[PDB]
Amino acid sequence: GPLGSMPRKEKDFQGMLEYKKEDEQKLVKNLILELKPRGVAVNLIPGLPAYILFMCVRHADYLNDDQKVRSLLTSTINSIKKVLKKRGDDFETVSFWLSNTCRFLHCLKQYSGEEGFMKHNTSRQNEHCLTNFDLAEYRQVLSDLAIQIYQQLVRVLENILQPMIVSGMLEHETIQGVSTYTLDSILRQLNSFHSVMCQHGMDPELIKQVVKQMFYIIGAITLNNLLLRKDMCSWSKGMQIRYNVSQLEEWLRDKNLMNSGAKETLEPLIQAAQLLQVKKKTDDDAEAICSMCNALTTAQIVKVLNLYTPVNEFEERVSVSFIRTIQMRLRDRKDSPQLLMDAKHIFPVTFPFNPSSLALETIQIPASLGLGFISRV
């Protein structure tokens, strides 16, 4: 039936989107620069802007149009940087663009046509692979861009967290008979950060990295305050920290994040709290401290013992002899000289490939996005 029949059947959409060269700057403006992150569509389908962008890349490749391909990827990358500069003080917008930049990168891989990335693809998804261009070079650029966005997300979340840490982990006291933010404030805030990331469809492997980084920041700020303040080094602070850490650990358990590396970053703080609790008088007490505090430096152990504030009914001041016993024993240990931890340290981030089951041929364009000048192919 190669000739025409009536009625004429509507075409079967292939999951591509065409646009006119003259409309490129409008396209990125509407889909990136002035896109509302709280829009219904882009939250019902997390990563929608990235998918739409990819579908557009797809049509340009289909037409074997190298010039349109180059121009679109360059506009897409520059616009993402643009919106990150203007709006990057806000956690929501940075989480949103980190997630869409990752999804865009994942799409470039999943539909590259390279066999190594096609492994979880359906037959249909494989029909959607690029056929004319190798975009490996652009992927590296997007990954570097994603590294920069992550570092900004960490700066944003640190600025929200930092004022809560000391107050929440150290200063709130309820213990009786033994001598503003709470632990709940911190737990709620971690919950909020994590809920937003999940709702944005951020990679679970990336979310795990963000969580490890947030727990590192908690532990480092808290421990640095113990090492600078006499009033924070006491048996009862030790008990309160021990409990606060247990709740943070239970947050990890509840969210199934026990593999994020988050817990392990608390180990110095944990051992400091334990040190505040143990006996500090005899040679045996000293040996036990040295073998217990394997994750603290000699400088940190010694500092805690010097600052230690005794409650006389229960204990005494730590003696100069005892500290000298600790120092002699720790001579055989080859430790780091650090006293304070670097609370600004950022673990290097990775973006392991996370293919999607979304079927591009089922995507439709909502009017709200202001993209009527685009058409489906």
Author numbering: 1461 to 1639, 1658 to 1855
The article reads:
Type V myosin (MyoV) motors move protein complexes, organelles, vesicles, and mRNAs along actin cables. The C-terminal globular domain (GD) defines this class of myosins and mediates the majority of cargo interactions. In vertebrate Myo5a, the GD also mediates autoinhibition of ATPase activity in its cargo-free state. In this study, we describe the high-resolution X-ray structures of the GDs from human Myo5a and Myo5b as well as low-resolution SAXS-surface envelopes for all three human MyoV paralogs.
Indeed, a Myo5a fragment consisting of residues 1467–1855 (Myo5a (1467–1855)) was resistant to degradation and not prone to aggregation. By performing molecular replacement with the derivatized structure as template an atomic model was built with this native dataset at a resolution of 2.2 Å (Rwork = 0.22, Rfree = 0.26). The asymmetric unit contained two almost identical Myo5a molecules with a root mean square deviation for the c-α backbone atoms of 0.30 Å. The overall structural core of the Myo5a GD is hook-like shaped and its overall structural arrangement and connectivity is conserved in type V myosins. It consists of 11 tightly packed α-helices followed by an extended region that clamps the entire structure like a bracelet. The peptide chain ends with a short helix, and a C-terminal two-stranded anti-parallel beta-sheet that folds against the very N-terminal residues. Previously reported point mutations at residues I1512, M1515, and D1521 in the Myo5a GD are almost completely buried in the crystal structure. Thus, these Griscelli mutations are likely to destabilize the GD. Fitting our high-resolution X-ray structure of Myo5a GD into the low-resolution electron density of autoinhibited Myo5a allowed for only one possible orientation of the GD.
